[PDB]
Design an enzyme around this catalytic site. Structure first.
Site, short mmCIF file in Angstrom:
data_model
loop_
_atom_site.label_atom_id
_atom_site.label_comp_id
_atom_site.label_asym_id
_atom_site.label_seq_id
_atom_site.Cartn_x
_atom_site.Cartn_y
_atom_site.Cartn_z
N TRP A 1 0.80 -1.24 0.00
CA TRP A 1 0.00 0.00 0.00
C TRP A 1 0.84 1.30 0.00
CZ3 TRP A 1 -5.13 0.76 -0.92
CH2 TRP A 1 -5.96 -0.38 -0.97
N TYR B 1 -9.94 -0.22 2.92
CA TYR B 1 -10.83 -1.27 3.37
C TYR B 1 -11.08 -1.33 4.90
CZ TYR B 1 -10.88 -2.84 -1.47
OH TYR B 1 -11.01 -2.89 -2.83
N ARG C 1 -30.40 -13.38 5.10
CA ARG C 1 -30.04 -13.08 3.70
C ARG C 1 -29.43 -11.68 3.57
NH1 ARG C 1 -35.27 -16.37 2.87
NH2 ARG C 1 -36.18 -14.31 3.39
N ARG C 2 -28.95 -11.15 4.69
CA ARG C 2 -28.48 -9.76 4.76
C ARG C 2 -27.08 -9.69 5.35
NH1 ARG C 2 -34.05 -7.19 7.40
NH2 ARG C 2 -35.41 -7.78 5.63
N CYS D 1 -12.22 -1.62 -5.52
CA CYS D 1 -12.33 -2.74 -6.46
C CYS D 1 -13.10 -3.94 -5.87
CB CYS D 1 -10.92 -3.20 -6.91
SG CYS D 1 -10.15 -1.93 -7.97
N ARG E 1 -15.73 -5.27 -8.83
CA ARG E 1 -16.11 -4.52 -10.06
C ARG E 1 -15.05 -4.50 -11.17
NH1 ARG E 1 -13.33 0.02 -10.70
NH2 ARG E 1 -12.12 0.83 -8.85
N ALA F 1 -10.77 -6.12 -12.06
CA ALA F 1 -9.75 -7.09 -11.58
C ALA F 1 -8.64 -7.16 -12.61
CB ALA F 1 -10.36 -8.46 -11.35
N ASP F 2 -7.40 -7.15 -12.10
CA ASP F 2 -6.18 -7.28 -12.90
C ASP F 2 -5.92 -8.75 -12.75
OD1 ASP F 2 -3.48 -7.59 -13.83
OD2 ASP F 2 -2.78 -5.80 -12.69
C1 LIG Z 1 -2.06 -6.99 -6.00
C2 LIG Z 1 -2.41 -6.10 -4.84
C3 LIG Z 1 -2.26 -6.55 -3.54
C4 LIG Z 1 -2.57 -5.74 -2.45
C5 LIG Z 1 -3.06 -4.43 -2.54
C6 LIG Z 1 -3.24 -3.90 -3.80
C7 LIG Z 1 -2.93 -4.71 -5.02
C8 LIG Z 1 -3.27 -3.78 -6.13
O1 LIG Z 1 -3.14 -4.09 -7.37
N1 LIG Z 1 -3.71 -2.58 -5.68
C9 LIG Z 1 -4.10 -1.56 -6.47
C10 LIG Z 1 -5.28 -0.82 -6.24
C11 LIG Z 1 -5.69 0.23 -7.05
C12 LIG Z 1 -4.93 0.59 -8.17
C13 LIG Z 1 -5.36 1.73 -9.06
N2 LIG Z 1 -5.57 2.94 -8.56
N3 LIG Z 1 -5.51 1.54 -10.30
C14 LIG Z 1 -3.77 -0.11 -8.44
C15 LIG Z 1 -3.38 -1.16 -7.60
C16 LIG Z 1 -3.73 -2.58 -4.33
O2 LIG Z 1 -4.10 -1.60 -3.58
O1 LIG Z 2 -37.21 -7.50 -6.12
C1 LIG Z 2 -37.36 -8.36 -5.28
C2 LIG Z 2 -37.60 -7.99 -3.97
C3 LIG Z 2 -37.79 -8.98 -3.02
N1 LIG Z 2 -37.73 -10.31 -3.35
C4 LIG Z 2 -37.96 -11.24 -2.20
C5 LIG Z 2 -36.76 -12.11 -1.86
C6 LIG Z 2 -36.95 -12.38 -0.38
O2 LIG Z 2 -37.77 -13.52 -0.20
C7 LIG Z 2 -37.70 -11.18 0.15
C8 LIG Z 2 -36.78 -10.28 1.00
O3 LIG Z 2 -36.53 -10.83 2.29
P1 LIG Z 2 -35.09 -10.74 3.00
O4 LIG Z 2 -34.14 -11.41 2.11
O5 LIG Z 2 -34.77 -9.28 3.15
O6 LIG Z 2 -35.08 -11.41 4.32
O7 LIG Z 2 -38.24 -10.52 -1.00
C9 LIG Z 2 -37.49 -10.67 -4.69
O8 LIG Z 2 -37.42 -11.82 -5.11
N2 LIG Z 2 -37.30 -9.70 -5.63
O1 LIG Z 3 -7.57 -5.89 -5.22
C1 LIG Z 3 -7.39 -5.44 -6.34
C2 LIG Z 3 -7.28 -4.07 -6.49
C3 LIG Z 3 -7.06 -3.56 -7.76
N1 LIG Z 3 -6.95 -4.38 -8.86
C4 LIG Z 3 -6.71 -3.66 -10.14
C5 LIG Z 3 -7.83 -3.81 -11.16
C6 LIG Z 3 -7.71 -2.54 -11.98
O2 LIG Z 3 -6.80 -2.73 -13.03
C7 LIG Z 3 -7.13 -1.51 -11.03
C8 LIG Z 3 -8.19 -0.48 -10.60
O3 LIG Z 3 -8.47 0.47 -11.63
P1 LIG Z 3 -9.96 1.00 -11.92
O4 LIG Z 3 -10.78 -0.17 -12.26
O5 LIG Z 3 -10.43 1.67 -10.67
O6 LIG Z 3 -9.99 1.96 -13.06
O7 LIG Z 3 -6.59 -2.25 -9.94
C9 LIG Z 3 -7.06 -5.77 -8.68
O8 LIG Z 3 -6.99 -6.61 -9.57
N2 LIG Z 3 -7.29 -6.28 -7.42
#
Ligand SMILES: Cc1cccc2c1C(=O)N(c1ccc(C(=N)N)cc1)C2=O
Ligand SMILES: O=c1ccn([C@H]2C[C@H](O)[C@@H](COP(=O)(O)O)O2)c(=O)[nH]1
Ligand SMILES: O=c1ccn([C@H]2C[C@H](O)[C@@H](COP(=O)(O)O)O2)c(=O)[nH]1
Ligand SMILES: Cc1cccc2c1C(=O)N(c1ccc(C(=N)N)cc1)C2=O
Lengths: 312, 312
Positions: free
Chosen positions: B82, B146, B178-179, B198, B218, B220-221
């Site tokens: 970091w 994190y 489920r939460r 990420c 969202r 991943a490298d």
């Molecule tokens: C493999 C690895 C392991 C630990 C922590 C981190 C990573 C990593 O790749 N990033 C990371 C996160 C964000 C960005 C970015 N700003 N584009 C680049 C690298 C980390 O923080």
């Molecule tokens: O868009 C939706 C909204 C709710 N549910 C259902 C799933 C669960 O049975 C319930 C939510 O209950 P909890 O998971 O919050 O306990 O509503 C769906 O299938 N789709």
């Molecule tokens: O735990 C992590 C953190 C970051 N990345 C990589 C993925 C992306 O290449 C970059 C983040 O860039 P953006 O998606 O935010 O643009 O860091 C990972 O693979 N794993």
């Protein structure tokens, strides 16, 4: 066919589901981590194996897209699918001078006498929400529902943020962004709020001029909820693409828990004997591109040929 | 074998990836919506096809689990992963009286002369963070990373919330909830913050006395990031289960975008000629159950038999 992943999800939970005793007097069978994929270029994934009311999906989504959280808008479109949580609040207030409605859901199926009573108190609520502005304000507004989370997220600093609006702008100027994310999950609200959102988070992605969306849904009622959910999010994907001038890609529906109630089994079993038909096609107003301003008539569903609804 | 989904992800992006021009002077190949699954009862999914430093994963995760956001703790465990965002902040300040480090990443590979300069300014930063309390406070603290999102989420009302701590309590008293959700994605922070997380969100699930976790990531490298990510979240799953007295289930790793950089291709290609070996086994301190208080020595990795690291 297009809807096959839904049917395969249903059958997987039926044959391999884990049984769990349930909050509400039943059990569920569930699996964790299942995904479905729908290629939106192949048709619109409104299920043909059971009629799903596209009208209700459309007006609910327009409601969210307005940032609206008041049920009056839904009532004005003859959509009652959010009534209950609104009713559930008014019933628990000082003003409410009528018959007791504690656990009104439980007693509605069991006693055919109490059902017609609630049918009437809920008729009273609706009309009053429709015509009484002050009443609409107090009881019609659900506060923390998708329209607020998507378009008016409350910030620590007293302000409010249009996440989806900002994301749409980002799709148009930075289509390859890996941050096209709309979340509905607020750790500050979730301990107390009415329902911590089931459609927890979604993400967009663009390749080759096509827009995809992935939904992460923490909890899903496969029988009743999922067919609506698939349609809303596919609709949303088409609407966003239309606004950004793109073609449609995939809708990827990813679940945490996805479940069947131990009492819904025959219904889903009967649905599985049915054979998917060609999917319908969606048509959107070529003259409107701001979806925050779309109306019911801006969205048409063509050639929908469903098997009967299942009342279950 | 256990690690096969990683290799299959890599090969899918290699053969079917979509090319996209990249923010940083390259391109990527990517796919959207891919999932991997790892059955944790079968071994610990630290890759055998390339050495992955488990020490760094362990100390980084302990760091998060403390709610710590200060790099001093990582430095004290000889973990530099970091450092850069911390350096990236100190370099952009008033106090910094040395050579200019604008785009220091870009110039490090290209000019072997500037590399040894930065090697020394980063050595200066580290030691000072380690020994100077006031300096550690100002520059060592990354703020929104994190540990803060998981354990000290800032609320509109000036307060702070331990989501993961609350979720662990919920696993113990309401395992079938489920939460069981921990999010790292805050719509208020994400427009301005250093890196919008990420590892966006994770969810737990329990069946048959076994704990599963699903991560939604969202972005991943695949080459450099994902092998660490798989290991941290699997480790986290074992640690949570250990604390709740459960057995281990699945780790399900779900992606938004997962990508390879156009310059990392030979490396991953060479890795794909390698044949997975039996997985290592993890052992945890049978006398400690509060993971917020775990130390490096409370976690042992047995029988790790990896192919060489790939420096690429
Ligand atoms: C493999 C690895 C392991 C630990 C922590 C981190 C990573 C990593 O790749 N990033 C990371 C996160 C964000 C960005 C970015 N700003 N584009 C680049 C690298 C980390 O923080
Ligand atoms: O868009 C939706 C909204 C709710 N549910 C259902 C799933 C669960 O049975 C319930 C939510 O209950 P909890 O998971 O919050 O306990 O509503 C769906 O299938 N789709
Ligand atoms: O735990 C992590 C953190 C970051 N990345 C990589 C993925 C992306 O290449 C970059 C983040 O860039 P953006 O998606 O935010 O643009 O860091 C990972 O693979 N794993
Ligand atoms: C099919 C459907 C369609 C539209 C809106 C909703 C549903 C639905 O099932 N719920 C819903 C949400 C939450 C809960 C709940 N609190 N356990 C129950 C039902 C809705 O709001």
């Amino acid at each position: 066919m297009l809807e096959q992943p839904y049917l395969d999800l249903a059958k997987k939970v039926l044959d391999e589901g884990h049984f769990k005793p349930d909050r509400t007097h039943t059990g569920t069978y569930s699996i964790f981590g299942h995904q479905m994929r729908f290629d939106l270029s192949k048709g619109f994934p409104l299920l043909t194996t059971k009629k799903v009311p596209f009208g209700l999906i459309k007006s609910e989504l327009l409601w969210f897209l307005h940032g609206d959280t008041n049920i009056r808008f839904l009532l004005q479109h003859r959509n009652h699918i959010w009534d209950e949580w609104a009713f559930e609040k008014w019933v628990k207030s000082d003003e409410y001078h009528g018959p007791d409605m504690t656990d009104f859901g439980h007693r509605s199926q069991k006693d055919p006498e109490f059902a017609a009573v609630y049918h009437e108190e809920m008729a009273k609520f609706d009309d009053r929400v429709l015509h009484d502005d002050a009443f609409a304000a107090k009881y019609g507004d659900l506060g923390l529902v998708y329209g607020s989370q998507w378009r008016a997220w409350h910030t620590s600093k007293g302000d409010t943020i249009d996440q989806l609006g900002d994301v749409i702008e980002q799709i148009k100027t930075h289509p390859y962004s890996r941050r096209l994310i709309v979340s509905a999950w607020n750790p500050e609200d979730v301990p107390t709020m009415a329902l911590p959102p089931c459609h927890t988070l979604y993400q967009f992605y663009v390749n080759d001029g096509k827009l995809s969306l992935q939904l992460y849904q923490r909890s899903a009622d496969i029988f009743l909820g999922v067919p609506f959910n698939i349609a809303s999010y596919a609709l949303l994907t088409h609407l966003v693409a239309h606004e950004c001038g793109l073609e449609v890609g995939e809708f990827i529906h990813t679940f945490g828990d996805a479940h069947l109630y131990v009492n819904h089994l025959d219904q889903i079993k009967e649905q599985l004997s049915r054979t998917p038909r060609p999917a319908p096609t969606l048509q959107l107003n070529p003259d409107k591109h701001d979806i925050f301003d779309f109306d019911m008539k801006d969205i048409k569903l063509l050639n929908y040929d469903p098997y009967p609804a299942i009342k279950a």
